[PDB]
Amino acid sequence: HHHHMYQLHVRVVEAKELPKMDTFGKCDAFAILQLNSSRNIHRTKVIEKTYTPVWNEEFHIPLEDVTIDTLTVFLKDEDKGSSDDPISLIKIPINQFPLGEVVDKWYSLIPVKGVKKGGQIRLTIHIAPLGATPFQKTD
Numbered sequence: 001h002h003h004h005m006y007q008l009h010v011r012v013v014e015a016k017e018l019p020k021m022d023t024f025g026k027c028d029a030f031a032i033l034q035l036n037s038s039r040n041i042h043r044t045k046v047i048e049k050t051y052t053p054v055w056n057e058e059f060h061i062p063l064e065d066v067t068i069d070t071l072t073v074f075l076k077d078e079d080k081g082s083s084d085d086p087i088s089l090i091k092i093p094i095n096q097f098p099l100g101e102v103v104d105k106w107y108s109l110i111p112v113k114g115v116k117k118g119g120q121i122r123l124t125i126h127i128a129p130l131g132a133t134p135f136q137k138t139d
């Protein structure tokens, strides 16, 4: 290639202020990550029965065009006797992240229709050139 080929490294750290998504429980949250409308989707594990889940899971997503790519983060509640319940989502433009910076930030999610509040999610995001160590700060 005659241009840089960037990688999106994302740590899904934790969430807070989640809504009650179960009549007899609290929330069993997991997060789904999707670049643009890609068929490669990533999902975290489920953290049962808490409004403040901690996942600390890392994902590595090749980028097509840092000037236009978007990362959608979608929170859902796992259920056992019914289908999972959508909670909230945020679409994050990749072009807002300085190349090579490790950015650790909280994000407000937008609740889906019918959900009272969307929560916040903490993501550590690092746009780095191909081969660079994920989450390694610039030197």
Ligand SMILES: [Ca+2]
Pocket (backbone or CB within 6 Å): 021, 022, 023, 077, 078, 079, 085
């Ligand atoms: Ca539920």
Ligand SMILES: [Ca+2]
Pocket (backbone or CB within 6 Å): 021, 022, 025, 027, 028, 077, 078, 079, 080
């Ligand atoms: Ca549930």
Ligand SMILES: [Ca+2]
Pocket (backbone or CB within 6 Å): 079, 082, 083, 084, 085
């Ligand atoms: Ca359900």
Ligand SMILES: [Cl-]
Pocket (backbone or CB within 6 Å): 018, 019, 020, 116, 117
């Ligand atoms: Cl609620």
Ligand SMILES: [Cl-]
Pocket (backbone or CB within 6 Å): 097, 098, 099
């Ligand atoms: Cl930049």
